[PDB]
Design a binder for this molecule. Structure first.
Ligand SMILES: [Mg+2]
Ligand SMILES: [Mg+2]
Ligand SMILES: [Mg+2]
Ligand SMILES: [Mg+2]
Ligand SMILES: [Mg+2]
Ligand SMILES: [Mg+2]
Ligand SMILES: [Mg+2]
Ligand SMILES: [Mg+2]
Ligand SMILES: [Mg+2]
Ligand SMILES: [Mg+2]
Ligand SMILES: [Mg+2]
Ligand SMILES: [Mg+2]
Ligand SMILES: [Mg+2]
Ligand SMILES: [Mg+2]
Ligand SMILES: [Mg+2]
Ligand SMILES: [Mg+2]
Ligand SMILES: [Mg+2]
Ligand SMILES: [Mg+2]
Lengths: 106, 62, 62, 88, 129
RNA sequence: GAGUACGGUAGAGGGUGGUGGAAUUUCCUGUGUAGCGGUGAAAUGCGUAGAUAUAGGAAGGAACACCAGUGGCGAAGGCGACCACCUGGACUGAUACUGACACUGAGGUGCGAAAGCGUGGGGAGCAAACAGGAUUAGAUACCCUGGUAGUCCACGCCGUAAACGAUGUCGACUAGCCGUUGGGAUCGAUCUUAGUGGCGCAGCUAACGCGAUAAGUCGACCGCCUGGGGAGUACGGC
């Protein structure tokens, strides 16, 4: 109904609650009435430039099919979270499942 | 672009995105690579999105 | 705008490499373009003149 | 402004010969519904003139269609104007 | 917005003889057919054909004689903005009678000479020389 | 002819919020010293009260390089950071549907660059007025150092521009060649559409030139002109 590909990256110092943080978020999509069709993780990556005097962050992408209220609450949680550091969404009209790339190399 | 690999390209295959960025982080004009107008148009915004995510740099100096 | 030194070549090849890199970057053009404000009318006039010159060159190529 | 489902509902409840959409009544109903659904959008966005141009275009088109229908058949005009319930 | 189709017939014929073509195709009508018939009767065109199937099309074959078109000048007199009507004695004589002027009388669409012979005036439609 | 229903594309079309990096300026702190800035040449100005360069930090405002194109969108004016939400129109494919429901349009109704006006905010760069230094016979200018309104936002007003293609809107016909934007169909080629450019045959034009995006051949309706000044001025109305 309203798909959203959201890529969220988080502070490296707190790159251990991210394993549980998604369950603090995915928790919503079911009682809203939506389904996640993809979730990946390639966190602890190198930054291109300094974002509040850091150079590394833990990345995570996921797809969501939720209502407006779920979007509002998740973005408000991002806004008032101390880690947050970055957020962005790519609302699309389809579904994608097959990861993003992982590493095609050995 | 047209034969097999991705009719529409997202900002995902950085192996393709980095092929279209100059050594100083600028975007290569279409007349140099010889690509098409539609693909250049979507490729520019793909690079901008990837660049905001701090995957790619604004400037090579920074 | 930046080049490394390595493997003790004479200090002229690296100089020409730096010159070539700087002129690929087009730094001089951009820094000249910021010396004074160009009102938009002059900008469109210059672009139109460049376009007509380019098309005349391409037509005269045959 | 309208989507597929409610457009189908309107053409269903305003059809004339089981499979027509060009009849005047369907067009007037669709235009009136779209105008009504756009009024609340224009309530909040006062400085959007470019869309208000299209709104006025729909208003004029509906007026033309109503004039033609009143020219053709009076009774159908009265029935339609009563069902949509608008001044003229 | 196609306010007048007979002027469109005349203009199509004129522009086609300027371009050195042989056949002209257009939508047909019971007035265009009469005009084409009188033109053929006067010898200004070779033939005219009308198709079937609710959208009939008039196809006119043009003459050339020498290296110049046979129809030298053609012009519509009574446009939908004037509606000129003439009597018997006021019927125009184009080029001293060498050409013809089409008149729609109560007896049908015909030429000025026929109207003078029958003693009937009418609605002047176009002039050809 | 005109319009409706159904899929799919492209777009700086409009509105409301949020978020980015670079760069300028100002303030604070560190080593370090005597010059910086500017010009045709200078000077005003800033300077050991530690500048510029340089390192670290802080606040604040505005514009969105590279893509970028005879490129796109919009009735015109005009519209380039990214993201979400609300929304208008155009283009494209087949079928069904309505069955002339159309064109133009005196009055009227709106939208309408920039400058300007009112109330309340904000204020980094720039910069009418203005101050000083030059140049000059003079220089109420061009040049240099500063600098206020304004340029920015909300609401309201103002109705103007070389508001230009100096070319009113709508419809139909008339050789061709080379590009290009975004869609289809056939077997890279061909065919066909809606735009957007460069040449060019007839034809037109006083000439320049226009030439399927006519200024050619024709229709429908509207606006306007009648020697140069006085003058788009006076008087009256709004
Ligand atoms: Mg300093
Ligand atoms: Mg009109
Ligand atoms: Mg008027
Ligand atoms: Mg008006
Ligand atoms: Mg203004
Ligand atoms: Mg003001
Ligand atoms: Mg004020
Ligand atoms: Mg000055
Ligand atoms: Mg004042
Ligand atoms: Mg005027
Ligand atoms: Mg303009
Ligand atoms: Mg004028
Ligand atoms: Mg035309
Ligand atoms: Mg030409
Ligand atoms: Mg003329
Ligand atoms: Mg006079
Ligand atoms: Mg006056
Ligand atoms: Mg007056």
């Amino acid at each position: 109904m309203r798909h959203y590909e959201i890529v969220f990256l988080v502070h490296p110092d707190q790159s251990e609650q991210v394993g549980g943080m998604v369950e603090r978020y995915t928790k919503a999509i079911e009682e809203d009435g939506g389904k996640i069709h993809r979730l990946e993780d390639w966190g602890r990556r190198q930054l291109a430039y300094a974002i509040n005097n850091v150079h590394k962050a833990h990345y995570v992408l996921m797809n969501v099919e939720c209502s407006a209220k779920a979007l509002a609450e998740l973005e408000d949680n991002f806004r008032y979270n101390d880690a947050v550091i970055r957020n962005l969404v790519m609302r699309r009209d389809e579904a994608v499942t097959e990861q993003s790339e992982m590493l095609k190399a050995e | 672009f047209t034969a097999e690999g991705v009719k529409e390209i997202d900002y995902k295959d950085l192996n393709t995105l980095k092929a279209y960025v100059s050594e100083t982080g600028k975007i290569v004009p279409s007349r140099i690579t010889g690509t098409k107008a539609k693909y250049q148009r979507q490729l520019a915004t793909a690079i901008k999105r990837a660049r905001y995510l701090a995957l790619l740099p604004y400037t090579d100096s920074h | 705008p930046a080049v490394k030194v390595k493997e003790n070549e004479p200090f002229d090849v690296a100089l020409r490499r730096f010159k070539r890199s700087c002129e690929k970057a087009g730094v001089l053009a951009e820094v000249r373009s910021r010396e004074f404000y160009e009102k938009p009318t002059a900008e469109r006039k210059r672009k139109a003149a460049a376009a007509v010159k380019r098309h005349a060159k391409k037509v005269q190529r045959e | 402004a309208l989507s597929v489902e409610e457009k189908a509902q309107i053409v269903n409840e305003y059809k004339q010969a089981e499979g027509d959409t060009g009849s005047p009544e369907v067009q007037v109903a669709l235009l009136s519904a779209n105008i009504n659904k756009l009024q609340d959008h224009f309530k909040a966005n006062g400085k959007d003139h470019h869309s208000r141009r299209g709104l006025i275009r729909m208003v004029n088109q509906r007026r033309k269609l109503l004039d033609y229908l009143k020219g053709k058949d009076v009774s159908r005009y009265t029935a339609l104007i009563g069902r949509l319930g608008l001044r003229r | 917005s196609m306010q007048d189709p007979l002027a469109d017939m005349l203009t199509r014929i004129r522009n086609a003889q300027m371009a050195e073509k042989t056949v002209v195709s257009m939508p047909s009508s019971k007035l265009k057919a009469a005009v084409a018939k009188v033109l053929k009767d006067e010898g200004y065109i070779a033939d005219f054909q009308i198709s079937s199937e609710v959208k009939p099309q008039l196809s006119i074959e043009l003459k050339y004689f020498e290296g110049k078109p046979v129809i030298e000048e053609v012009k519509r007199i009574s446009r939908p903005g004037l509606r000129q009507y003439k009597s018997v004695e006021q019927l125009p004589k184009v080029r001293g009678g060498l050409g013809v002027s089409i008149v729609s009388t109560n007896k049908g669409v015909m030429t000025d000479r026929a109207a003078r012979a029958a003693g009937v005036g009418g609605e002047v439609l176009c002039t050809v020389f």
